[PDB]
N, C-alpha and C. Protein backbone atom coordinates (compact mmCIF):
# COMPACT_ATOMS: atom_id res chain seq x y z
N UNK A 1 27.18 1.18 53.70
CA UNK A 1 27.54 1.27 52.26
C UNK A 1 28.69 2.25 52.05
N UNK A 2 29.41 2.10 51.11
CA UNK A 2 30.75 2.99 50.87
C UNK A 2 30.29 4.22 50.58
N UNK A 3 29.08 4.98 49.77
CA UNK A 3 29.27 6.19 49.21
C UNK A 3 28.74 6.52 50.72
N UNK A 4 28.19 6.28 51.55
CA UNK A 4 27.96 6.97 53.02
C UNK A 4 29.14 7.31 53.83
N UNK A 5 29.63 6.37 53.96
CA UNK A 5 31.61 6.05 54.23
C UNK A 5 32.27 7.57 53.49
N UNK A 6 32.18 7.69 52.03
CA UNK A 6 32.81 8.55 51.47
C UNK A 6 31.99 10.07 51.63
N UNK A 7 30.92 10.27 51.97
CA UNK A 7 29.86 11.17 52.90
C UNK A 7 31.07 11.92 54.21
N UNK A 8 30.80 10.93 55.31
CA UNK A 8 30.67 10.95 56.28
C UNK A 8 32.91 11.34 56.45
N UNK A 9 33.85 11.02 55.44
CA UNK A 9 35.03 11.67 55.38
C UNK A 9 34.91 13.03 54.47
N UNK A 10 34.17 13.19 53.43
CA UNK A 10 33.98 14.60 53.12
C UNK A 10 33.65 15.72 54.74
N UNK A 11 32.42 15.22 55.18
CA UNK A 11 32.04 16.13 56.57
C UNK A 11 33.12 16.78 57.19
N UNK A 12 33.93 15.13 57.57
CA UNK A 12 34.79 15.60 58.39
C UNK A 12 35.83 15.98 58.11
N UNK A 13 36.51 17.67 58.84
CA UNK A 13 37.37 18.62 58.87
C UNK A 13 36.47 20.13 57.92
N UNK A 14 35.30 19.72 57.24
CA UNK A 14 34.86 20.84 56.67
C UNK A 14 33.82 21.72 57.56
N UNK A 15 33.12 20.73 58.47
CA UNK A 15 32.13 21.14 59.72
C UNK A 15 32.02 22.67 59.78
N UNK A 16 30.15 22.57 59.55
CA UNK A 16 29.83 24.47 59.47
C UNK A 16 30.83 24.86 58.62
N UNK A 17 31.40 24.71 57.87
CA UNK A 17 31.84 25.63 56.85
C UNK A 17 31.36 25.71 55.26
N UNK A 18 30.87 26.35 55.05
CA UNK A 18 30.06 26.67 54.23
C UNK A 18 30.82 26.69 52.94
N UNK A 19 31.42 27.57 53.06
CA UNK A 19 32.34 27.40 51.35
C UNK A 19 33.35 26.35 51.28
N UNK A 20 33.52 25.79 52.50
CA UNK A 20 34.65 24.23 52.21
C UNK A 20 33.73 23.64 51.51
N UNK A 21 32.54 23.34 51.93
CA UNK A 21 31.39 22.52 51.55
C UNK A 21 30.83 22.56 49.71
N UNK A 22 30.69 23.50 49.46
CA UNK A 22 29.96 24.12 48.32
C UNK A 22 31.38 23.83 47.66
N UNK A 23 32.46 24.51 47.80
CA UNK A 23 33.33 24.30 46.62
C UNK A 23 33.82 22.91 46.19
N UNK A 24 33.52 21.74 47.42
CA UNK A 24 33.70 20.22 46.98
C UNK A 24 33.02 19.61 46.69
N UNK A 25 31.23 20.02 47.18
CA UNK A 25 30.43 19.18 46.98
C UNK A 25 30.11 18.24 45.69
N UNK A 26 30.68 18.98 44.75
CA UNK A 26 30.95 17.61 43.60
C UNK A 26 31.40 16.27 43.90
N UNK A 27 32.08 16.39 44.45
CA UNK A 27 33.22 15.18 45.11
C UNK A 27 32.43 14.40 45.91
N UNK A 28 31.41 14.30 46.46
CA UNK A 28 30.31 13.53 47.14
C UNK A 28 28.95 13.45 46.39
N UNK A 29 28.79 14.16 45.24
CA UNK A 29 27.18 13.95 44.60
C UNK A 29 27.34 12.31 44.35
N UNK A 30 25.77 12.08 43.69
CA UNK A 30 25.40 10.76 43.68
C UNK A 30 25.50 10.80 41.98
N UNK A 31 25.99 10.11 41.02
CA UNK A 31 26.24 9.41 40.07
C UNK A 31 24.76 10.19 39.22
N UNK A 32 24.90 10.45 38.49
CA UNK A 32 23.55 10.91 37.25
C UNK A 32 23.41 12.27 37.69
N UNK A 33 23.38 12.82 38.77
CA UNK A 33 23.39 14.34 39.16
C UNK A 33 23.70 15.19 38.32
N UNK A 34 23.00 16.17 37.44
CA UNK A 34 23.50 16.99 36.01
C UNK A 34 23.44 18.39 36.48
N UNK A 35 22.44 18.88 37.55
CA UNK A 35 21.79 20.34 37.90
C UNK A 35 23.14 21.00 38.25
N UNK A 36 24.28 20.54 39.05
CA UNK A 36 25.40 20.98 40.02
C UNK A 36 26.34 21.11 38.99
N UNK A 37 27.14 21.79 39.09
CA UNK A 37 28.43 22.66 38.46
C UNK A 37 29.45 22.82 39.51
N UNK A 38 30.61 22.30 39.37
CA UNK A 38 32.03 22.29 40.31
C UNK A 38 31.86 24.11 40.90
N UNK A 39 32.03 24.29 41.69
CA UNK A 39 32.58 26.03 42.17
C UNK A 39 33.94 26.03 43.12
N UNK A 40 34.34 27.30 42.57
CA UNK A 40 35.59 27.43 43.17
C UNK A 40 35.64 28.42 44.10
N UNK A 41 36.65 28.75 44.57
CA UNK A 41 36.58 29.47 46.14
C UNK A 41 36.42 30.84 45.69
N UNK A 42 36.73 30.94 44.29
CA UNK A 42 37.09 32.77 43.72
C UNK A 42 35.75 32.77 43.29
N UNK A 43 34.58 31.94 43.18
CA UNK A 43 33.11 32.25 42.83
C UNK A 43 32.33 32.39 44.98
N UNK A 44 33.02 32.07 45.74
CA UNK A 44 32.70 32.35 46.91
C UNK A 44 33.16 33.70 47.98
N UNK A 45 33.32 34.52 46.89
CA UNK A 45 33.90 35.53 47.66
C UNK A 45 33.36 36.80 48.48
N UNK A 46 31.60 37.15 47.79
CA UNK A 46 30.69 38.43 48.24
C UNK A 46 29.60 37.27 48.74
N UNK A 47 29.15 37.80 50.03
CA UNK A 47 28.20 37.21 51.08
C UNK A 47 27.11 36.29 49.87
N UNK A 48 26.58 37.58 49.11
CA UNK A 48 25.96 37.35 47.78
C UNK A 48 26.08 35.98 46.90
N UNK A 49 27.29 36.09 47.13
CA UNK A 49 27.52 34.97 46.14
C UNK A 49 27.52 33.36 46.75
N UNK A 50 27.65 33.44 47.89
CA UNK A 50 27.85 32.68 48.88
C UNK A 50 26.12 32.04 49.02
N UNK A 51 25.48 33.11 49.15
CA UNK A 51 23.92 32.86 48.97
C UNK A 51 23.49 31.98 48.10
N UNK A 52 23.84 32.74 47.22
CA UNK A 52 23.50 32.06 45.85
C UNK A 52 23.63 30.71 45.15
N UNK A 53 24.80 30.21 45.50
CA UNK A 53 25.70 29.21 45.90
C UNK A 53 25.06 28.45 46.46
N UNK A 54 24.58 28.59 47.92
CA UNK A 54 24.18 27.76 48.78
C UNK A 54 22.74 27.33 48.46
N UNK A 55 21.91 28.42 47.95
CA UNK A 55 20.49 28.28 47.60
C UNK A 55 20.62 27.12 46.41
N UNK A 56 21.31 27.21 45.52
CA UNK A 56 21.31 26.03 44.36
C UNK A 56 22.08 25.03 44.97
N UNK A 57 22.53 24.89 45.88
CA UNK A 57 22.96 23.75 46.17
C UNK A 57 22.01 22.85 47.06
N UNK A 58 21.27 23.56 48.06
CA UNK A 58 20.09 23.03 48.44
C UNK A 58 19.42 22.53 48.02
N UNK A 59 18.73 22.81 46.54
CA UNK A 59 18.09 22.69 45.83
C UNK A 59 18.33 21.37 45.09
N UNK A 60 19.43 21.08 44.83
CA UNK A 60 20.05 20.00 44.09
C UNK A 60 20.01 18.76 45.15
N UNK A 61 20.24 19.22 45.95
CA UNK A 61 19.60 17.84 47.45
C UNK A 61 18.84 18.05 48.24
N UNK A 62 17.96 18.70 47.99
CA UNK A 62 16.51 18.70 48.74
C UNK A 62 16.41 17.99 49.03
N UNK A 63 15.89 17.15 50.48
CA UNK A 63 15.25 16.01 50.89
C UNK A 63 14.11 15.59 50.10
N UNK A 64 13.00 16.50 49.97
CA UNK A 64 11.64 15.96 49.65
C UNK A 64 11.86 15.89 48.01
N UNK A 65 12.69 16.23 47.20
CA UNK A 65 12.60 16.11 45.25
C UNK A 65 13.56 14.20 46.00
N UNK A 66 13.89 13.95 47.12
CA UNK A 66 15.43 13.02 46.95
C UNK A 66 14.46 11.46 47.49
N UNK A 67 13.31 12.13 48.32
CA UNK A 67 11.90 11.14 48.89
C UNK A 67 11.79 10.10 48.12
N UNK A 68 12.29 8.51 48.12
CA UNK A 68 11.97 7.87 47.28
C UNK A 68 13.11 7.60 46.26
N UNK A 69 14.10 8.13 46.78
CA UNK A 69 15.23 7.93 45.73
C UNK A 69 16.41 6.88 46.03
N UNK A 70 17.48 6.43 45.17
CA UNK A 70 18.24 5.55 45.95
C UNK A 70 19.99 6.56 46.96
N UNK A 71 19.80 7.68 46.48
CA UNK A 71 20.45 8.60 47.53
C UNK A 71 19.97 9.70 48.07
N UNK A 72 18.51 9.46 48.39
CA UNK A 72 17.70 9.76 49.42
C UNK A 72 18.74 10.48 50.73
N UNK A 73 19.61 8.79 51.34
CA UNK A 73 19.86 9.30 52.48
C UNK A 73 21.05 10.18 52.31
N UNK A 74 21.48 9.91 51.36
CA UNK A 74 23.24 10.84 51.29
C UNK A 74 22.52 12.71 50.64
N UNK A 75 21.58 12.70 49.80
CA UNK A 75 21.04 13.93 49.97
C UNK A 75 20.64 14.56 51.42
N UNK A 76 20.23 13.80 52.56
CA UNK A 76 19.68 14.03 53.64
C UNK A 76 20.85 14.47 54.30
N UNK A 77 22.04 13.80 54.24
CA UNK A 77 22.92 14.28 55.08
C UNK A 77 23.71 15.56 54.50
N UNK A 78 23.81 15.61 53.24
CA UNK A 78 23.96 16.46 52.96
C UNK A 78 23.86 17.95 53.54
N UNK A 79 22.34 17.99 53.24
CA UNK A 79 21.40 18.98 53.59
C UNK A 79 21.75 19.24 54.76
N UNK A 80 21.86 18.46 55.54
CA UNK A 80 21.78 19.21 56.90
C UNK A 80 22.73 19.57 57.22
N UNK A 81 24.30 19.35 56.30
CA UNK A 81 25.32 19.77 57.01
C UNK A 81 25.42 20.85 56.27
N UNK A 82 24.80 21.87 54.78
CA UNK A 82 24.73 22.71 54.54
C UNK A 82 24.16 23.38 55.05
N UNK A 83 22.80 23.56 55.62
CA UNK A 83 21.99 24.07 56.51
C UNK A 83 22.63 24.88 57.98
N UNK A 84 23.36 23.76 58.67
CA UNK A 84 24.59 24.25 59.99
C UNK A 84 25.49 24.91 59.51
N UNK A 85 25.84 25.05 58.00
CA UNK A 85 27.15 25.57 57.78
C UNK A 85 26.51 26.73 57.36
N UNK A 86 25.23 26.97 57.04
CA UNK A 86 24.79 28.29 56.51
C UNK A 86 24.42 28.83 58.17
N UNK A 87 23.60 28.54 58.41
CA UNK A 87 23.60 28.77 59.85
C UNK A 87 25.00 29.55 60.52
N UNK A 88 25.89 28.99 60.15
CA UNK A 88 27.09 29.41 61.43
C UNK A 88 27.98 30.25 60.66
N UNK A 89 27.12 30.50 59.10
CA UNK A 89 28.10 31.99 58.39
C UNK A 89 27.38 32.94 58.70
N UNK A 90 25.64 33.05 58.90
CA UNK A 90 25.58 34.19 59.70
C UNK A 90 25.49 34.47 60.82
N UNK A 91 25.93 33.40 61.92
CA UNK A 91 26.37 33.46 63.36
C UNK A 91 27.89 33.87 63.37
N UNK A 92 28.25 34.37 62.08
CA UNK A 92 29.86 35.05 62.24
C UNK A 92 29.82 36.67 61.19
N UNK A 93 28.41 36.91 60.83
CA UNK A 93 28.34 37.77 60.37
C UNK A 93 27.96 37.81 58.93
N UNK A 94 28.98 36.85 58.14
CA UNK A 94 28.52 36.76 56.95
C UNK A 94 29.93 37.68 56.47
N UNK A 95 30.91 37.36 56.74
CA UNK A 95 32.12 38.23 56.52
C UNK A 95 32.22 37.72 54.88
N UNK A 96 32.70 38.79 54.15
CA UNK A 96 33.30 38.16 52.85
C UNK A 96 34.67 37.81 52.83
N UNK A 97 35.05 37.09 51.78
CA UNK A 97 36.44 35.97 51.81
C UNK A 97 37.44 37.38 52.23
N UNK A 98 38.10 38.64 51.63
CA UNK A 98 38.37 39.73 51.61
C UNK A 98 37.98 41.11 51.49
């Protein structure tokens, strides 16, 4: 299906990166999605905020609220590429933008 297609070119070049991810993820939600708010790179700048960020974005594609849904699987992939990208900001420390 195309919105998987349009998934699967968001991923790629953003890989483990955490704030590439979060500041586009609009650009890949699924159609009716209201919880998510666009963010920009100047709201990603203290580790903190980055957290924060990431925690509501999880949240908005949880697998198990997505169980039963018709973008079930594009929440799924989602998730997991936020998950590696959170993962590999504190396998670099958790540096802030400046």
């Amino acid at each position: 299906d195309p919105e998987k297609l349009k998934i699967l070119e968001w991923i790629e070049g953003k890989e483990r990166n955490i704030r590439a991810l979060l500041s586009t993820m609009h650009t890949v939600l699924w159609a009716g999605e209201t919880k998510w708010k666009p963010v920009g790179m100047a709201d990603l700048v203290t580790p903190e905020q980055v957290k924060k960020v990431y925690r509501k974005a999880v949240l908005v594609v949880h697998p198990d609220k997505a169980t039963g849904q018709p973008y079930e699987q594009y929440a799924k992939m989602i998730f997991m590429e936020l998950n590696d990208a959170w993962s590999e900001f504190e396998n670099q420390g958790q540096k802030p933008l400046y």
